[PDB]
Design a protein around this ligand. Sequence first.
Ligand SMILES: C[C@H](CCC(=O)NCC(=O)O)[C@H]1CC[C@H]2[C@@H]3[C@H](O)C[C@@H]4C[C@H](O)CC[C@]4(C)[C@H]3CC[C@]12C
Length: 307
Amino acid sequence: KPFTLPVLTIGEMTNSRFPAPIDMLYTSPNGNVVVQPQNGRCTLDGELQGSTQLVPANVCAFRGKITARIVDQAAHQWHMQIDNPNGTLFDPTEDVPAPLGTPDFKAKIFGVISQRNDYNDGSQGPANRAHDAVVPTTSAKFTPKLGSILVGTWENNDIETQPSKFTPVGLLEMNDFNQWSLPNYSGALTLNMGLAPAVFPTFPGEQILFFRSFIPLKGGHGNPAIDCLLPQEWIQHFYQESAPSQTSVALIRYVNPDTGRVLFEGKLHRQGFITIAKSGDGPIVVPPNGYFRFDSWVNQFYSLAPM
Ligand SMILES: C[C@H](CCC(=O)NCC(=O)O)[C@H]1CC[C@H]2[C@@H]3[C@H](O)C[C@@H]4C[C@H](O)CC[C@]4(C)[C@H]3CC[C@]12C
């Protein structure tokens, strides 16, 4: 069964690590950083890894129920028991780091917590409320592997012990934001388990190619970005196809359909990430209609043309 890529321009792709369209291609040496995201992870033959699931709306979202105020915190802080972001119960026994779609980076994540009561007020139906909220993945009480997280709100009174959804919007602040720093999915207890492995180039002169989205920031200065190894569409595609990988590397070419010419080439590794022959930190300048084309199976030590 032949391996394929979907035919998509970068304006038609979705970030697999934060709910946002892809804004640009991006590359970096990432010298003293371990690139090990848990969302957006899928082998070329369709094996999901880490905390990766299929629905873009579930990425960095939470669903569950607020059960109490955080102990010894009389204001602004809520204990939220979480399920899988698709309402299904969460089994901590499974070899995953967290409920699928849980954020895979340290940050104060800004969004909205919304509640629909699970009972009716007479003929009117259930009551509702929604407020600005923060999920600090840096908190010791961020323990999604154990089924609970801390949620902070500016509202201190209008929150009930009721079914709750967290819709992510962006970052609250730049402080403690590191997109390559994995959260302690079990807080101060044990360590992280079920992880997708770190990815890195193994051939000299190569760097990882990222699909980058710039995400909102509630205050302060900065231009925070989320890089993913694979767009969500490729993950959904590989999962459907499950095409066997003939080698460890698929040779892909970025093609301009207007001129028909190849602009650059990259190595799509079996583990689900791209390397290119390029040095430096910055965007890859590309035309609007360009797309990736799968051309050949090659070896781990294939030499790419420098770009
Ligand atoms: C308690 C948590 C996280 C604390 C932390 O980083 N480490 C301590 C720990 O290990 O829990 C903090 C981090 C950011 C805080 C929020 C943000 O500062 C924004 C906001 C500021 C308002 O003055 C109070 C509510 C509100 C919404 C804060 C509530 C408490 C939060 C959610």
